[PDB]
Amino acid sequence: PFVPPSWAPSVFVPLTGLVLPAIAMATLFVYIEKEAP
Amino acid sequence: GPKRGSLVKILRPESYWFNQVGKVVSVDQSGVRYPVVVRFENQNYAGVTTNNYALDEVVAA
Amino acid sequence: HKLFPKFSQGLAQDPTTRRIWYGLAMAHDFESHDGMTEENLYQKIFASHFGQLSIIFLWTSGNLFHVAWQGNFEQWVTDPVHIRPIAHAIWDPHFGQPAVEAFTRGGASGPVNISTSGVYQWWYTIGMRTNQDLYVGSVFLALVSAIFLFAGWLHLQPNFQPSLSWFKDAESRLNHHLSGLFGVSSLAWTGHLVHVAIPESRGQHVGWDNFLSVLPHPQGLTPFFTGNWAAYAQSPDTASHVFGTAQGSGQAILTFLGGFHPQTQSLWLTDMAHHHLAIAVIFIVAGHMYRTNFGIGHRMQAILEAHTPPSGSLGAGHKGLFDTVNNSLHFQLGLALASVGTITSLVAQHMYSLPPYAFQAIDFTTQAALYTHHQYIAGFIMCGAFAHGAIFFIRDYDPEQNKGNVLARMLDHKEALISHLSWVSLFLGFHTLGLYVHNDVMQAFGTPEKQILIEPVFAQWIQAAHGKALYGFDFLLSSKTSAAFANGQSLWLPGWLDAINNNQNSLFLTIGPGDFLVHHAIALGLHTTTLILVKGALDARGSKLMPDKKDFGYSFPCDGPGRGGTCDISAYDAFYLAVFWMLNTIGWVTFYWHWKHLTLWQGNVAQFDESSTYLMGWLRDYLWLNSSQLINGYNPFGMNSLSVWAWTFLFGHLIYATGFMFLISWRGYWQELIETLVWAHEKTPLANLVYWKDKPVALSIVQARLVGLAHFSVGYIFTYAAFLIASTSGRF
Amino acid sequence: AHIVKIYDTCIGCTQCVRACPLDVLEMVPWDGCKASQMASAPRTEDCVGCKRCETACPTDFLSVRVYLGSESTRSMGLSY
Amino acid sequence: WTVPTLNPDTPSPIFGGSTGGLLRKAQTEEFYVITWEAKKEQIFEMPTGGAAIMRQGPNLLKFGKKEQCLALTTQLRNKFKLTPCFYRVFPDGKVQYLHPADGVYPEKVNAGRVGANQNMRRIGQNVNPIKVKFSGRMMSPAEI
Amino acid sequence: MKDFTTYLSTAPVIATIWFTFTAGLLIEINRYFPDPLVF
Amino acid sequence: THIKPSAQVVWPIVGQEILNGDVGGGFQGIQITSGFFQLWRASGITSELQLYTTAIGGLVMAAAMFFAGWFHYHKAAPKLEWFQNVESMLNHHLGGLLGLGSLAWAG
Amino acid sequence: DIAGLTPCSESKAYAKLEKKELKTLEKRLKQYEADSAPAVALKATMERTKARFANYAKAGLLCGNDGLPHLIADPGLALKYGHAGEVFIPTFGFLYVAGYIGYVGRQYLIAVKGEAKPTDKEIIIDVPLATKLAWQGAGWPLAAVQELQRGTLLEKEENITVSPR
Ligand code: CLA
Ligand code: CLA
Ligand code: CLA
Ligand code: CLA
Ligand code: CLA
Ligand code: CLA
Ligand SMILES: CC1=C(/C=C/C(C)=C/C=C/C(C)=C/C=C/C=C(C)/C=C/C=C(C)/C=C/C2=C(C)CCCC2(C)C)C(C)(C)CCC1
Ligand code: SF4
């Protein structure tokens, strides 16, 4: 019970290619530009 | 310390002319901290040939 | 001000874009954070080490999983001579149908990459036969990676943070790491070899289902407890053994044969079992040396205080070195990097020549890729060893604790050291370049019989001492009437002699005047890189141009245009200048390795022996000749499977060239350009409604050197990787 | 801010003061040298770290030293 | 000598307007205002680029950074034998006089100045960087 | 003439004359003894 | 159309003699690419003698130029208001140099 | 012989390379006249080629599989098989002339440091003193080992040293 299905690159490659870089760069940008109290 | 015109040897370790020989111009007799004026026949990287030294930084050699 | 970076409020109060880069760059330099003590230093380093372990095991589990799902391992093991090892499948929606057809090679459904990492050979030799086995290994190593990441998080917790005494305990750590981490691990790998990897090569499956009901030897443990240990060397594998099957097999589990298995052209599993068993016993015995809480044992400070020679020829000797190795992490890191870099060179040099894995050295692209991969890794690690040694001199070195010892006397004769390194570098450079230019003038003027061809008689003497009957010296292993020959002749020499007298492998290749000239160029590169690195380490405290260099630290830009100007005066900048000589030197050793092996693999070693003696022969017959199918990877007639390596070849040339921009052009030009850009943005209507939060400035001097060296190095690596993989795979 | 220090080898030649493009240094009364003058750096918050003072100092070694430190908007020489 | 005050209603030099003047730093953070009194009408060189005519009497320019006011001060002091003073102005309206902060120019000794940042030792008499490890920050051995 | 000999005693002129002599000497030796590799 | 322009020959020492290649015309040398042969044919030169006389003429003119340098620096050196006559300089250079140059060349 | 190398006068690729160079030179020769200067220069080239191959076969050089002369750099093996003329006699000849140059330069430096203008005698070369030392430099190995044995070859530790040492 190990083999991931036949549709798996079509989701996982654009996920870590586009969605997680967008979320990660937005999150790191908001963390960089945050003011200290 | 040494008289005018005599040769000394520099023992200030961060001097350019450390462990080398210069010539005494004058020794100031006030309470100045570095009175011994020594001239050197070669220039440092700044192009200076003259420096003040202390009494325990020069040895008449 | 701003929050990032949390470790430095001096950087957090920076109103510019320099803050982001310097927060990225000073993140893992824990000795220079705000409020850092020594216990906190060692604890965060311990957690980071756990993080490194978790990343390595996740990397290995990912390699296993992508092979097990998208490769052809179970099909490769049936005929590993004619089938190419698949790395992972390609999903690129930017492709076209010719590219999908081209990277769909076989036997695969869609587009794949063909692996050049040797993992199929390594996994097949250690006993993998199916994909499920690789799935179980991937799940196991992912669970191990999760355990190490959790253990880093756990040993950060305040009920689990170790004290400074636990980190500064050297005898316990050497006893546990020699006896357990080296010895018991090597013993357990011997257990894996004997129990699994040898019967899998005999054609018998020994998995977890039956490893308790299958005998490793037909008389188990009775020779081992009787002392009749030679009963495990009886009946070895025959010289007509088909690997992985039962035809031509034996019963032995621990032989000592020398040379190679005849089919796979690789080391014997029984010899590797015996080898790991012997070094396991030696490391377990050596792991009982130092004094832990049991009365017996050696005291390292006592050993160091004792080894001071008479007559004062080393002064105080090794007095006070224990408190300077123990208290400094940069000394320990430089020692570790020097050892691991030399061992990585050892791995590459011994794995091309003595290939361990089944059907390695018939996969020529795997041979070239693994050699070049560990040689460049070794070069970077050696440069880091000298870098952290210079950091040791600047930060950790106390002169009063070392008044008179070996470390102070090196600083005393640093000028003699740098002078004689300068001499050997100038000598090797003048005469190596002069001999190559001389032979080029001879080859240009039509007279090859005038060119200076010095024969490498010293290394040929050494090969004759090793047992090679080509050069006719005939002594010590090449003469049949020798004591060493006659004593080793009964047991391990008959395989070693056949393997060293075979001229169809990399075991002690035939050498000539080209090999002379290149080994001299290699010595030039080594001595020169050592000159820059030793000069940067020993002039790190200060020089006559700057006596107070220790007061600015390790990586400062300069000391201004005064005193004639002081550019690249820092020890970091000496490292920076020496990375170029590292890349040059490894480029020389891998050009040499690759061209001598391409001429071995094609069949005409006469081509290397003739054209290697002149640099036009180099440029014509290696670089121009072997890049004919590379640059035809795509063209206006179509494309094929080498188009990714043609694109990556041009990609590396581009990154190299972009690095030259940061290397040559410096800061104030770009700062003036950015100030005009700031004017233009603040005056442009309907775009000055958008304003930066961080003030844009040009990159600093040190950052510029780092970015230029980074682009330079990445382009260097990608260009030679694309050329080497594409030439070897396209022509074999 | 950049760390600017004055050392007792100063001979009060005023060269560093007339070399600084930012008015950071000044001369104070002193008794350690024949000139009865010593340099001093009371306004290092405006110092950019150009090291013209160090270029102008005649003594060997330097009597004025500039240790580049944490950057601000004044020390980076920004007009924006 | 007393600390003078900034007169914002001081006439400026005759100048057609450069692209190298003030920016949003003058509106958000600070800008500096330089003031001198001339003896005659005479052309000088603007530090931001270009030429300008100073008036006969009180003059007034405003710059972004401090080195621009020092460059114009050095020009007006070595070329025209004038005595300018330049101030620091905030968008609040806070006005900070400086240069000459003592009233006497810093290139000559004045009794009353307190010596700051003076190590009373040589540079070779500093400690090693091992002696200043693990403080609250990065430190140089010349800081102590 | 004394000043002209001092100018001929200056460093680049003597380097030119001496390298001309040394190069011509090697050229003459390679002409009359063509292609020497040993001895 | 079948002889390659060559005007440099090397001496037979240390094997560099091979550089004298088969350029045609019963000659051996380095093929030149400056275009002097085409310039000389366009100017109507037909013999080596005319080229030799042009060489002597150019050497004589070089001696005249170095004498002119020495003369106008050490013996009779022009004044600043001579150098500042730019209107006259333009008149003389546009007439005499370009104008009489191209007139005499057209001649 | 040494290292499996045949002698060049016994080697066959050496004769093949000689014949090949003669073939190229005569293919270039066969497109001229007889008394023409290109034909004379090419016949001088062929004469020098034959003389060079005969001299290298006469000197006892060792050829490989490519027919090219190989040099032996080992003092004992060279002196045993008659090959001192290719590395060993050239290295002592070089060390003689290189120490000549270095010793004449050192004597000129010591001679010009003892004046009131050493840099002036370094920019404008004292030609009689330089020729005097250049002729007297022939006894440089004897003079060098004597200055070694007196303790005057070497400066003491009055040298310039850095802050570290
Ligand atoms: C860590 C090593 C590693 C590497 C370099 C790769 C590389 C790849 N994977 Mg694989 N993957 C791995 C481990 C790895 N994998 C493991 C162990 C599993 C089993 C859980 C998978 C399950 C998997 C599937 C189902 C698929 C891929 C696919 C791919 C390809 C496309 C990238 C992608 O979207 O994957 C996504 C990556 C994952 C799903 C696993 C990552 C999970 C770990 C815990 C994240 C680690 C993050 C890392 C430490 C830091 C990165 C973030 C940081 C830089 C900010 C690429 C070749 C796709 C493919 O095959 O294309 C043809 C695809 O469909 N991977
Ligand atoms: C720093 C970057 C770097 C990278 C990316 C690589 C990459 C590679 N190395 Mg190289 N290597 C490197 C540096 C690197 N190396 C250095 C610095 C050294 C010197 C130390 C080596 C020495 C080396 C050797 C000797 C070999 C490689 C091999 C390889 C290849 C196989 C992948 C692998 O290592 O599996 C991942 C490995 C592991 C996850 C660990 C393996 C198991 C360890 C050794 C012991 C486990 C003990 C066990 C846990 C104890 C249980 C005890 C019991 C009682 C419970 C891969 C190309 C192999 C190869 O070339 O194959 C074709 C190979 O044989 N490397
Ligand atoms: C055992 C391994 C090891 C460990 C634990 C350390 C630890 C340390 N090193 Mg050392 N070092 C090592 C090995 C190691 N190093 C090696 C192998 C080298 C040679 C490269 C060095 C050379 C070196 C230098 C010159 C310096 C350090 C420094 C440091 C300290 C701070 C690191 C930091 O903050 O940088 C953060 C890391 C970065 C900002 C990395 C930037 C990325 C680099 C430039 C590579 C970019 C290539 C890119 C990834 C390729 C992308 C390709 C693309 C197509 C995908 C830390 C003590 C610094 C120090 O001590 O300061 C006083 C320092 O100056 N190290
Ligand atoms: C082909 C490019 C090239 C060459 C030939 C060199 C050569 C050298 N480098 Mg350099 N270097 C280079 C690129 C190169 N480098 C690059 C890209 C970098 C990165 C910035 C460096 C950074 C670097 C550092 C940090 C160091 C060196 C050092 C050296 C010297 C080491 C000792 C030696 O072997 O000298 C042998 C001598 C030569 C190779 C020069 C040839 C001499 C010529 C042929 C003689 C004259 C011929 C002819 C008469 C010329 C007539 C022309 C006329 C107009 C005058 C050597 C001169 C080291 C050094 O200087 O030690 C003393 C050193 O520490 N290099
Ligand atoms: C418009 C100017 C002009 C042009 C186009 C020519 C063209 C030619 N000249 Mg002539 N020549 C000229 C004026 C010009 N001449 C003048 C003023 C003199 C006296 C110095 C000469 C003296 C001269 C000699 C001795 C010879 C030639 C020869 C030639 C032919 C050879 C190629 C060449 O010279 O490149 C073409 C040149 C140019 C394109 C640049 C000329 C620009 C001039 C110097 C300034 C003109 C500026 C003008 C007001 C605006 C033009 C702007 C721009 C488009 C050029 C070619 C037909 C050779 C010949 O006769 O072969 C058959 C030859 O032996 N010329
Ligand atoms: C630069 C290092 C070096 C190296 C690697 C060699 C290598 C060699 N030498 Mg040579 N030699 C050298 C420098 C070197 N030599 C120097 C500088 C001298 C002058 C002092 C000699 C004088 C010399 C003589 C007289 C002989 C050799 C011989 C040899 C060969 C065998 C000896 C051996 O293996 O010892 C390893 C080499 C060293 C440790 C370097 C020191 C060399 C010492 C000073 C002399 C060694 C001679 C040896 C004792 C004789 C052995 C006889 C042999 C038949 C067993 C071997 C190829 C012998 C030979 O001809 O073999 C066929 C021989 O008879 N050498
Ligand atoms: C800077 C610095 C540093 C670093 C250093 C380094 C980096 C080093 C390296 C080093 C190295 C890297 C070294 C090496 C070495 C090696 C060796 C030492 C080897 C040896 C060998 C041997 C001895 C062998 C022998 C043999 C043979 C040859 C053959 C036969 C076998 C036998 C075994 C016998 C430190 C940290 C300390 C700190 C201080 C500073
Ligand atoms: S560095 Fe620039 S600013 Fe700081 S003191 Fe020296 S001159 Fe004045």
b/e per residue H46-78 (b: at least 16 CB within 10 A): bebbeebbeebbebbbbbbbbbbbbbbbbeebb
- Among E29, E109, E119, whose Cβ lies nearest the Cβ of D7? E119
Residues with Cβ within 8 Å of C490's Cβ and at least 6 positions away in sequence, in order, are none
C613: its two tokens: 């003696």
Neighbouring C-alpha atoms within 13 Å toward the C-beta of E15: 24
Query: Which of C260, C632, C578, B31 has the alpha carbon at shortest distance from D36?
Result: B31
Q: Left if phi > 0, otherwise alpha if psi is -120 to 50, otherwise beta: which for F33?
A: beta
Q: Can you list the pairs that C321-326 forms with residues at least 24 positions away whose Cβ atoms lie under 8 Å?
A: C321/C402, C321/C405, C321/C406, C321/C407, C323/C401, C324/C396, C324/C397, C324/C398, C324/C401, C324/C402, C324/C407, C326/C168, C326/C170
| Nearest chain F Cα distance for residue G15, angstroms | 9
Query: Which of C57, C49, C53, C208 has the alpha carbon at shortest distance from C143?
Result: C57
Q: In which element (H, E) is residue C41 found?
A: helix C38-70
Q: In which element (H, E) is residue E88 found?
A: strand E85-89
**Under a CB-based contact definition with an 8 Å cutoff, are residues C73 and C67 in contact?**
yes
In chain F, what residues touch C452 (CB-CB under 8 Å)?
Answer: 37
E-facing residues of D in 49-78 (CB < 8 A) are: 61-63, 65, 67, 73-74, 77-78
Cα–Cα dist C266/G14, whole Å: 51
Number of domains composing chain F: 1
Using the Cα atoms of residue C31, residue C32, residue C38 and residue C39 in order, give the sign of their dihedral: negative
- Ligand 8 centroid from CA C199, angstroms: 76
- C551·E129 Cβ contact <8 A: yes
**Under a CB-based contact definition with an 8 Å cutoff, are residues C134 and C123 in contact?**
yes
What single-letter DSSP state applies at residue C604?
-
Give the rounded distance of the alpha carbon of E135 from its chain centre.
Answer: 34
Residue whose structure tokens are 């080994």: C519
Query: Which of C526, C342, C512, C530 has the alpha carbon at shortest distance from C428?
Result: C526
**Under a CB-based contact definition with an 8 Å cutoff, are residues G13 and F31 in contact?**
yes
Chains that touch B (3 or more CB pairs under 8 A): C, D, E, H
Count CB-CB contacts under 10 A for residue C213.
Answer: 7
Count CB-CB contacts under 10 A for residue C138.
Answer: 21
Count CB-CB contacts under 10 A for residue H151.
Answer: 8
**Under a CB-based contact definition with an 8 Å cutoff, are residues C662 and C710 in contact?**
no
Cα–Cα dist F23/F3, whole Å: 28
Query: Which of C198, C538, C191 has the alpha carbon at shortest distance from C392?
Result: C538
Give the rounded distance of the alpha carbon of H119 from its chain centre.
Answer: 33
E-strand stretches of C355-436:
none
Ligand 3, CB cutoff 6 Å, lining residues: C 24-29, 333, 337, 380-381, 383-384, 387-388, 391, 554-555, 572, 575, 706, 710, 714
Cα–Cα dist C581/C565, whole Å: 24
Q: Left if phi > 0, otherwise alpha if psi is -120 to 50, otherwise beta: which for C669?
A: alpha
Neighbouring C-alpha atoms within 13 Å toward the C-beta of C379: 24
E-strand stretches of chain G:
6-8, 21-24, 27-31
Cα–Cα dist A35/H88, whole Å: 76
- D34·B32 Cβ contact <8 A: yes
Q: What is the 3-state secondary structure (H, E, C) of chain B?
A: CCCCCCEEEECCCCCCCCCCEEEEEEECCCCCCCCEEEECCCCCCCCCCEEEECCCCEECC
Q: Is C420 helix (H, G, I), strand (E, B) or coil?
A: helix
**Under a CB-based contact definition with an 8 Å cutoff, are residues D74 and D45 in contact?**
yes
| Test the G interface: residue of H24, H25, H43, H45 with most G CBs within 10 Å | H45
Residues with Cβ within 8 Å of H82's Cβ and at least 6 positions away in sequence, in order, are H60
H107: its two tokens: 């004597």
- C35·E136 Cβ contact <8 A: yes
G102 lines ligand 5 (CB under 6 A): yes
Q: Is D70 helix (H, G, I), strand (E, B) or coil?
A: coil
- What is the domain extent for residue D24? 1-80
Cis peptide before C107 (omega within 30 of 0): yes
Q: Which of C66, C100, C150 to mutate to test the pocket of ligand 1 (most atoms within 8 A of CB)?
A: C66
Cα–Cα dist C698/C704, whole Å: 9
**Under a CB-based contact definition with an 8 Å cutoff, are residues D16 and D64 in contact?**
yes
| Nearest chain C Cα distance for residue F28, angstroms | 19
- Pairing verdict, β E118-119 and D3-7: parallel
Closest atom of ligand 5 to G43 CA is: 64
H7 bridge partner residues: H62
Binding site feature residues of C for phylloquinone: 670
C71: its two tokens: 């490769």
Residues with Cβ within 8 Å of C321's Cβ and at least 6 positions away in sequence, in order, are C304, C402, C405, C406, C407
**Extents of the domains making up chain C:** 1-732
In chain F, what residues touch G12 (CB-CB under 8 Å)?
Answer: none
- Among G12, G26, G28, whose Cβ lies nearest the Cβ of H44? G12
C245: its two tokens: 């099957």
Axis crossing angle, helix H88-113 with helix H127-136, rounded to the nearest 10: 140
Torsion angle defined by CA atoms of residues C699, C703, C707 and C712, in that order, rounded to the nearest 10 degrees: 120
Asked whether A and F share 3 or more beta-carbon pairs under 8 angstroms, the answer is no
Cis peptide before C5 (omega within 30 of 0): yes
CATH class of C1-732: mainly alpha
Residues with Cβ within 8 Å of C681's Cβ and at least 6 positions away in sequence, in order, are C687, C688
C61: its two tokens: 């589990």
CATH class of H1-165: mainly alpha
Cα–Cα dist C517/C520, whole Å: 5
b/e per residue F3-21 (b: at least 16 CB within 10 A): eeeeeebeeeeeeeeeeee
Ligand 6, CB cutoff 6 Å, lining residues: C 457-458, 461; H 74-77, 80
Q: What is the CATH number of the domain that holds F15?
A: 1.20.5.510
- Among H85, H125, H127, whose Cβ lies nearest the Cβ of F39? H85
Residue C35: burial class (beta carbons within 10 Å; 0-12, 13-18, 19+): exposed
What single-letter DSSP state applies at residue E132?
G
User: Which listed ligand is nearest to C392 at the C-alpha?
Assistant: 7
Chains that touch G (3 or more CB pairs under 8 A): C, F, H
C30 touches chain E (CB under 8 A): no
CATH class of E1-144: alpha beta
Binding site feature residues of C: 558, 567, 653, 661, 669-670
Residue nearest to atom 37 of ligand 2 (CA): C60
User: Which listed ligand is nearest to H2 at the C-alpha?
Assistant: 6
- What is the domain extent for residue F15? 1-39
- Pairing verdict, β G27-31 and G6-8: antiparallel
**Under a CB-based contact definition with an 8 Å cutoff, are residues C599 and C512 in contact?**
no
- What is the domain extent for residue B44? 1-61
E-strand stretches of E40-84:
42-45, 51-54, 58-63
Binding site feature residues of C for chlorophyll a: 653, 661, 669
Cα–Cα dist H153/H147, whole Å: 5
**Under a CB-based contact definition with an 8 Å cutoff, are residues C478 and C490 in contact?**
no
- Pairing verdict, β G27-31 and G21-24: antiparallel
Residue nearest to atom 42 of ligand 3 (CA): C710
C558 bridge partner residues: C567
C574: its two tokens: 């000496």
E128 touches chain C (CB under 8 A): yes
How far is the CA of C609 from the CAs of C509, C510, C599, C724, in angstroms? 12, 10, 9, 20
Cα–Cα dist G75/C194, whole Å: 103
What does residue G50 show for φ and ψ, rounded to 5 degrees? Answer: -60, -40
C575 lines ligand 7 (CB under 6 A): no
Cα–Cα dist C409/H24, whole Å: 64
Residue nearest to atom 3 of ligand 7 (CA): C389
**Under a CB-based contact definition with an 8 Å cutoff, are residues C573 and C533 in contact?**
no
In chain B, what residues touch D11 (CB-CB under 8 Å)?
Answer: 52
Q: Is E45 helix (H, G, I), strand (E, B) or coil?
A: strand
Cα–Cα dist H115/E15, whole Å: 63
Cα–Cα dist G83/G85, whole Å: 6
Residues with Cβ within 8 Å of C731's Cβ and at least 6 positions away in sequence, in order, are C598, C602, C626, C629
- Among D28, D42, D48, whose Cβ lies nearest the Cβ of E109? D28
H130: its two tokens: 């330089």
Q: In which element (H, E) is residue D29 found?
A: strand D26-29
Sheet order of strands, E31-37 included:
E58-63, E31-37, E85-89, E95-98
Neighbouring C-alpha atoms within 13 Å toward the C-beta of H149: 6
DSSP string, chain H: -GGGPEETTT-HHHHHHHHHHHHHHHHHHTTS-SSSHHHHHHHHHHHHHHHHHHHHHHTT-EE-SSS-EEB---HHHHHHHT-TTTTHHHHHHHHHHHHHHHHHHHHHHHHHHTSS-HHHHHHBT-HHHHHHHHHHGGGHHHHHHHHHHTT-SS--S-S---S--
Radius of gyration of chain A (CA): 16
Using the Cα atoms of residue C608, residue C610, residue C611 and residue C612 in order, give the sign of their dihedral: positive
G57: its two tokens: 């003429």
Q: In which element (H, E) is residue D27 found?
A: strand D26-29
Radius of gyration of chain F (CA): 15
Axis crossing angle, helix F11-32 with helix F2-9, rounded to the nearest 10: 60
How far is the CA of C498 from the CAs of C248, C256, C257, C266, in angstroms? 20, 15, 11, 13
| Nearest chain B Cα distance for residue H115, angstroms | 13
Q: What is the 3-state secondary structure (H, E, C) of H130-147?
A: HHHHHHHHHHHHHHHHHH
Resolution (A): 2.9
| Nearest chain C Cα distance for residue G3, angstroms | 24
**Under a CB-based contact definition with an 8 Å cutoff, are residues H8 and H14 in contact?**
yes
Residues with Cβ within 8 Å of C307's Cβ and at least 6 positions away in sequence, in order, are C317, C318
Cα–Cα dist C48/C591, whole Å: 37
